[PDB]
Amino acid sequence: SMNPPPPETSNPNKPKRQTNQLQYLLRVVLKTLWKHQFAWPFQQPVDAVKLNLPDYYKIIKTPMDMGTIKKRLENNYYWNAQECIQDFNTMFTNCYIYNKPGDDIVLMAEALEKLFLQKINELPTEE
Ligand SMILES: O=c1cc(N2CCOCC2)oc2c(-c3ccccc3)cccc12
């Protein structure tokens, strides 16, 4: 069994921009989610080999996790906040697609998403 390569986190051809919104996404949003008691499964890509989930990457074709998001924020991969917000949403929706309502991992994702949306409500206006 094999895992796919992780999502891209470095590309010198992709234009980059540091914005106050992206800085908030790293300093407030990512940091707040990372320390939550339910963050740990989401801090790195799903290792479907070690978890014995051989169909995972047959169902989830846009993998995303907060370890990748952290790297993208810390390595200035993004042009805008919407790209980063989309990554968080991809992570949550993957979990809801692959698993059943009320499953433990779904409850964990939902707790993180509730917190994420609360933080997004305070996203600062662009400079
Ligand atoms: O969608 C997912 C399904 C699961 N699975 C299926 C249910 O049993 C446990 C493994 O695991 C996930 C994990 C994870 C769970 C436990 C340990 C490490 C990572 C992290 C992110 C998403 C998923």
- Among 65, 87, 79, 64, smallest CA distance to 22 is for 79
d(CA 125, CA 121): 11
Resolution in A: 1.3
- Does residue 78 contact residue 7 with C-beta atoms inside 8 Å? no
d(CA 30, CA 67): 10
Measured torsion, CA atoms of residues 123, 77, 97, 60, in degrees rounded to the nearest 10: 180
Ligand 1 binding pocket includes 112 (Cβ within 6 Å) = no
- Does residue 46 contact residue 53 with C-beta atoms inside 8 Å? yes
Q: Which atom of ligand 1 lies at the shortest distance from residue 94's CA?
A: 1
Ligand 1 binding pocket includes 95 (Cβ within 6 Å) = yes
d(CA 49, CA 121): 37
d(CA 9, CA 3): 17
d(CA 62, CA 18): 25
Q: Please state at what angle helix 81-98 crosses helix 66-74, rounded to 10 degrees.
A: 170
Candidates 105, 106, 107: which one to mutate for ligand 1, based on the most atoms within 8 Å of Cβ? 105
Asked how this structure was determined, the answer is: X-ray
Give the type of residue at 119.
K
Residue 101 gets the label, from left (phi > 0), alpha (psi -120 to 50) or beta, of beta
- Encoded tokens for 56: 């995972």
d(CA 81, CA 36): 22
Domains contained in the chain, CATH given: 19-123 (1.20.920.10)
- Does residue 30 contact residue 73 with C-beta atoms inside 8 Å? yes
